[PDB]
Design a protein around this ligand. Structure first.
Ligand SMILES: *[C@@H]1O[C@H](CO)[C@@H](O)[C@H](O)[C@H]1NC(C)=O
Lengths: 49, 49
């Protein structure tokens, strides 16, 4: 299973990785089962800038 | 081959419907499960909870 922990944080002002503390909560799980070995993210390239 | 249904015919050739139910223990979370209904709740009484 893989759990997507996420904490939406709007306190940030725009600085690169500021200091603080937070915590993240589980959302959902789903089994697949594979030698993943790689990862990538595609981009919505139809609007490029 | 066409079945050739006969409404006036007796047993055998009359329409009989058979349905199947396939159960498998795949590596998946609890998906089709029927539990028991929860009984009432008691307070200030030493019971098994
Ligand atoms: C394990 O990972 C390797 C990485 O390339 C892959 O070639 C292989 O098929 C994987 N084995 C299984 C059983 O998934």
């Amino acid at each position: 299973y893989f759990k997507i922990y996420s904490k939406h944080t709007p306190v940030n002002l725009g600085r690169d990785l500021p200091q603080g503390f937070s915590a993240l909560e589980p959302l959902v799980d789903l089994p697949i089962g594979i030698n993943i070995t790689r990862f990538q993210t595609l981009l919505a390239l139809h609007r490029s800038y | 081959q066409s079945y050739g249904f006969r409404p006036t015919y007796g047993v055998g050739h009359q329409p009989y419907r058979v349905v199947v139910l396939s159960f498998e223990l795949l590596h998946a979370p609890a998906t089709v499960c029927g539990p028991k209904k929860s009984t009432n709740l008691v307070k200030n009484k030493c019971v098994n909870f």
